[PDB]
Design a protein around this ligand. Structure first.
Ligand code: LDP
Ligand code: CA
Ligand code: CA
Length: 213
């Protein structure tokens, strides 16, 4: 059995968190696959290095240790949705973040509560690369359960994120997240007029989830 514990994000965790995020988003993210070629591993580490200081001092993120091996197997990066640092991304990841604002924007500022310390935005979540299906699912259940803990403890109103993989979308529904948008990713039109995820099947969705604490 996998026994885990949650530990607040520290400055030393920079390389371990990045390697978990890179070994979980690169070539596995359901959105960036349709933007090939032109998505590199450093495109995620560049964004992480840009906000690593802000991410640690906000005191909302954590890593997950395997207490048996005392090593990091997962991490959950979170921000105040009304206090997120804005990055100037220069790769094709800007298209992804503009699309996530397409989904999150109109809902966050017109339906979710106003003011700070209200919306805890689940920014990123990852697990170690060589985890088996049992440990990866167990780690996702642990990170989901612990994100709720951080929300209630920090006196937030709810948790809010956009789920782009079928596993996170099913975990969210199973965890009683309310669905506020089930957008079809191949219908999104970029500013240049094209559809960057246009080659995606109609079954691939971008679901905007929200859950009160
Ligand atoms: N906030 C939604 C989670 C997310 C963030 C960045 C991405 O590149 C991605 O595919 C998914
Ligand atoms: Ca998260
Ligand atoms: Ca808020």
């Amino acid at each position: 059995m996998l026994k885990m514990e949650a530990v607040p994000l520290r400055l030393e965790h920079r390389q371990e968190v990045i390697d978990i995020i890179v070994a979980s988003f690169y070539n596995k993210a359901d959105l960036e696959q349709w933007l090939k070629p032109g998505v590199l591993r450093t495109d995620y580490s560049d964004i992480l290095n840009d906000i690593w200081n802000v991410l640690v001092e906000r005191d909302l993120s954590f890593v997950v240790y395997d207490t048996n091996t005392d090593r990091i197997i997962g991490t959950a990066l979170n921000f105040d949705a009304r206090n997120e640092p804005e990055v100037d991304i220069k790769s094709k990841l800007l298209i992804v973040f503009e699309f996530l604002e397409f989904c999150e924007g109109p809902i966050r500022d017109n339906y979710l509560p106003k003011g700070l310390n209200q919306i805890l935005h689940s920014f990123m979540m990852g697990t170690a690369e060589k985890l088996n299906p049992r440990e990866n699912i167990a780690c996702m259940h642990f990170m989901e359960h612990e994100v709720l803990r951080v929300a209630r403890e920090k006196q937030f109103a709810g948790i809010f994120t956009t789920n782009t993989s079928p596993l996170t979308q099913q975990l969210a529904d199973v965890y009683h997240y309310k669905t506020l948008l089930n957008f079809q990713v191949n219908e999104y039109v970029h500013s240049d007029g094209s559809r960057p995820f246009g080659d995606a099947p109609d079954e691939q969705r971008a679901i905007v989830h929200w859950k009160e604490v």
